[PDB]
């Protein structure tokens, strides 16, 4: 398998990049949910 070494390096690199895109996407979704959100400190959802 060391004679085919670039194949494993490419498979590892492509999945790492794909997972980096999933991570970046999750952050952009979370940012979209939090953008402009302003809450009162007095808010207590057990009562409100």
């Amino acid at each position: 398998l060391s004679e085919y070494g670039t194949f494993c390096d490419n498979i590892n690199s492509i999945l790492d990049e794909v997972n980096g895109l999933l991570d970046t996407t999750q952050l952009h979704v979370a940012d979209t949910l939090m953008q402009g959100v302003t809450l009162s400190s007095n808010l207590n959802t057990n009562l409100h």
Binding site: Y4, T6, F7, N10, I14
Partner: protein, 48 residues
């Protein structure tokens, strides 16, 4: 020599197939990036 060269050919042809699959996938993301850019030119720059 044919036996050794055929192993090099299968390895190098497999490497080209992997690269071509990667490039097809990457250009699809570039097309969707270009579509978003054209939409921002039309809806953020030329008009609001």
């Amino acid at each position: 020599a044919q036996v050794q060269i055929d192993r090099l050919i299968n390895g190098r042809l497999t490497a080209l197939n992997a690269y071509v699959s990667q490039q097809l996938s990457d250009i699809s993301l570039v097309k969707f990036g270009a579509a978003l850019a054209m939409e921002k030119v039309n809806e953020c720059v030329k008009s609001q």
